[PDB]
């Protein structure tokens, strides 16, 4: 029996111990508390309100518009004419 | 800088160390493989009285 997981491009905050080893880590896009810890760059948060990021609505599609009619052009009478010159 | 016999211990895979803003505070020599610490030599201002 073995377990298989996957890796994605996330961001982590690591707490290095005095001896140099890693003793605790915090994911940065797991919970709003995680974003608060990332922005504060600390593992503990006190009471209050903190701005962590910004919310932007992204565009959905694109539209292009132009004059209603198209001025039509004599190619129909230049190509399909009765007679041409020599 | 001025080199000193470092007291902190390195895991067998690092090469140097830093504390804040890429300030290299330690290094290991490539030959003796001994962990040394780096600190700048003294500097300061001059005043006339």
């Amino acid at each position: 029996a073995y377990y298989v997981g996957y890796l994605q491009p996330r961001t982590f905050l690591l707490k290095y111990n005095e001896n140099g080893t890693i003793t605790d880590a915090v994911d940065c896009a797991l919970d709003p508390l995680s974003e608060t810890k990332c922005t504060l760059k600390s593992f503990t948060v006190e009471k209050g309100i903190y701005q962590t990021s910004n919310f932007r609505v992204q565009p959905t599609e694109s539209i292009v518009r132009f004059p209603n009619i198209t001025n039509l052009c004599p190619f129909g009478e230049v190509f399909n004419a009765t007679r041409f010159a020599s | 800088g001025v080199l000193t016999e470092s007291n902190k211990k390195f895991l067998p895979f690092q090469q140097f160390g830093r504390d804040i803003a890429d300030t290299t505070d330690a290094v290991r020599d490539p030959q003796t493989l001994e962990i040394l610490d780096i600190t700048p030599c003294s500097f300061g201002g001059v005043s006339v009285i």
Binding site: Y3, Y16 | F13, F16, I20, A26
Partner: peptide, 24 residues
């Protein structure tokens, strides 16, 4: 079968020693 990986899967991203430093 599925299982929840609580907090595992963390390693040393670089070969630079650090001590008592909170690094992102």
């Amino acid at each position: 079968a599925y299982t929840n990986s609580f907090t595992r899967g963390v390693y040393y991203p670089d070969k630079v020693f650090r001590s008592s430093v909170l690094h992102s």
